[PDB]
Amino acid sequence: APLGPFNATLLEQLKNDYQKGEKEVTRYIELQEKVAEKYIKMTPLSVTAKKKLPPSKDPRDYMTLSPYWWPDSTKIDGLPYIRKDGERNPEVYEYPERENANRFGDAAYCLGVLYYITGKEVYAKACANHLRTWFTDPKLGMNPNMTYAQAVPGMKKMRGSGFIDSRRFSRALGVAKLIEGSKSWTPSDKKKLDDWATAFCYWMENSTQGQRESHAANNHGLWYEAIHLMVLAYLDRTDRIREVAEQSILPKMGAQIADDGSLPQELKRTLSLHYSTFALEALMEANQITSQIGINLWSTPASNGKVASQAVDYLYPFYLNPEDWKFKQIKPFDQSRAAILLYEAGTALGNQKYVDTAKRIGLKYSTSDVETIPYLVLK
Numbered sequence: 001a002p003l004g005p006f007n008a009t010l011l012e013q014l015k016n017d018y019q020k021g022e023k024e025v026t027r028y029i030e031l032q033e034k035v036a037e038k039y040i041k042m043t044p045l046s047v048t049a050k051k052k053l054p055p056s057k058d059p060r061d062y063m064t065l066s067p068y069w070w071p072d073s074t075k076i077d078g079l080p081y082i083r084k085d086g087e088r089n090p091e092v093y094e095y096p097e098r099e100n101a102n103r104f105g106d107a108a109y110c111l112g113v114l115y116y117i118t119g120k121e122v123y124a125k126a127c128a129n130h131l132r133t134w135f136t137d138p139k140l141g142m143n144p145n146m147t148y149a150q151a152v153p154g155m156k157k158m159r160g161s162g163f164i165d166s167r168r169f170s171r172a173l174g175v176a177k178l179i180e181g182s183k184s185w186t187p188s189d190k191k192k193l194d195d196w197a198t199a200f201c202y203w204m205e206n207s208t209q210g211q212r213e214s215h216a217a218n219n220h221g222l223w224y225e226a227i228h229l230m231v232l233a234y235l236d237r238t239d240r241i242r243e244v245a246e247q248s249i250l251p252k253m254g255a256q257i258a259d260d261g262s263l264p265q266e267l268k269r270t271l272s273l274h275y276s277t278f279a280l281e282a283l284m285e286a287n288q289i290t291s292q293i294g295i296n297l298w299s300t301p302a303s304n305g306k307v308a309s310q311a312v313d314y315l316y317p318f319y320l321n322p323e324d325w326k327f328k329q330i331k332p333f334d335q336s337r338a339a340i341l342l343y344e345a346g347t348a349l350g351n352q353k354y355v356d357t358a359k360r361i362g363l364k365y366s367t368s369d370v371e372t373i374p375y376l377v378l379k
Contacts, residue, residue, distance in 0.1 A: 001292075003233040005174040005285060006113065007344070008292050010374040015117045028365075028376050029117060035368045036114050039107040040126045044133035045100045046140035052094070054148040060141065062101075063148035064165055065092040071153075080154025086270035086330055101168035104134050110370040112175035115182065124182035128189060131176050134169060136192040142169075144200035147209065160209030161216075164223045167285075170230040173197060177234060194235065201231045214248065218256065218265035219275055222282035225249045229289045238293055245290050245297065253283065254302025261314030272327035276315060277337055283308050284344045291348065298348040312345045312354070320357065339363055339378050340371070 001008045001015075017025035048059040067088045071078030092098055111127035114120070133140050149162025176193055179185045204210045204227070213224045225248050232240045256279065258264050266275035287297035301307050318325045319338035339361040346354030363372050365379040372379075 001116070002177040002180075003174075003236070003238070003289060003292055004177050005171045005230045005233070005288060007288055007374050009347075010377065011113065011116065014374065014376065018117050025376065028379075029114075031366060032110075032114060032373060033118070036110050036123065039110050039130075040122060042103075042107055042130075044130045044140075045104050046133055046137070047097055047100070047142040048140055049100065050096050054151075056148070058143065060143045061148055062097050062142055062146055062165070064095045064098045064150050064162060065089065066150035066152045066159070066162065067092050069152045078153075081152050098165075101165065104130055105168045105172045106370045108134075108172035109175050110373065112172075112178040113370075113373050116178040121183055124179040125184040127175070127179050128182070128184045131172065131179075131185075131193065132189060134172070135196050136189070141196070144196050145203045145207070147207075158209060160207075160211075160213035161220060163204075163209065163213040163227070164220055166227045167223060167230075170227045173234050174230045197231055197234050201228075201235065204228060204231065219263075219279035219282055221252045222249070222256075222279050222286070225252070226282045226286040229286050233289050241290065241293060242295065245286075245295050245300075249283075249286060249290075249297065250300065250302045253297075253308055254304045254306045257306045257308070257311050261310040261312075263311060267327050270328045270330050273315075273318060273322065273325050273329045273333050274331070276311070277333075277341065280308070280311055280315070280341055280345075281337070284341055287344070287348065296348055298345050309345065309349055309351075312342070312349075316342070316354070316357070319361075335361055336363060340375060343375070343378060 001012050014025060014029070018029050047062050050059060050063070053059060054061045054063040068083050068085055069081040070084055070087075070089045072080065072082050108127055108130045111123045111130065115123035115127060135141055146163050146166055149165045150159065151162070152159065173193070176185070180190055205214070213220060214228075215221065216224060225244055228244055229241055232244065256263055256265055263276045263279055266272055266279055269275045283297055290297050298308050298312070319335065319342060322333045322335060325333070339358050340363075341358075342354045342361070343358035345351070346358055359378060363375055363378045
């Protein structure tokens, strides 16, 4: 399989078994096709479908609200907003980008994965329509930046924390690699998307916000590098992937994991279990790319000898019984997230206990959750 944001082993296994005609994989893929018909029908979404415009007056600039920032009722205009950790301001849903990037990411990912597995041109055609409209269209396409991602009304300083939103569409970008060579994704389409990805990578690395986010001390830095790896894998910059893994990811991992395996920057949050898992999920998605070029982020040590498996070990008892979690977690934890994680770490470490627990927790066989497509092994 081409380089991309997916478990390449599972995707290749599904493709091979579907091509040979194995019964179980065949019926699973047929269910997935029934799930994807709605994405075939779905109208391609654009970042431009907003009424309230960013400070640039450009509807092609992505803009969202930072979720934990609320109007101050003690002020006449509510400004400046104040931060309430872990409490989502519903005003974030007045920025259509927030949920539309999620919808586009799901549609594109599903259609591209199913084209790769089945070879049916209809999935490549639909996926191309979604990619063209969101990325490269000269009117509907998103500008290759995140200047106004998670903006905060009343804040005078420039923030780069909104860059994490990119993970919603960067995955889609990577999945485009699966439809190259189809009849629907012309060399012209590929050239336009390559130019867009190069411009977005340049913005990533050279904007003040992108640099700031690249030096983030918590899960934001790890997710910045996961997004970076998706952009770099789409562009076939494998040497840059190696540079980023060894110069940025592994130092961040070695600084952010404590001696006992905990993640102190995430333990101080009101949703400490969620955010610990979120950091490990950044590492998981980054490893899906790095392991395709021979770099196992789960067992490769930082300069201080720490390894991400230490954090997985620290969290495992609380993935077994989330009630035992002793730090602040003011919302219920979705244990299904532990199913994929413990699988991805498990197979990456040969740890049969992690994989057995991942299967025991499991995923529901008929979920339309598109990131569970490659995981028939957990269903």
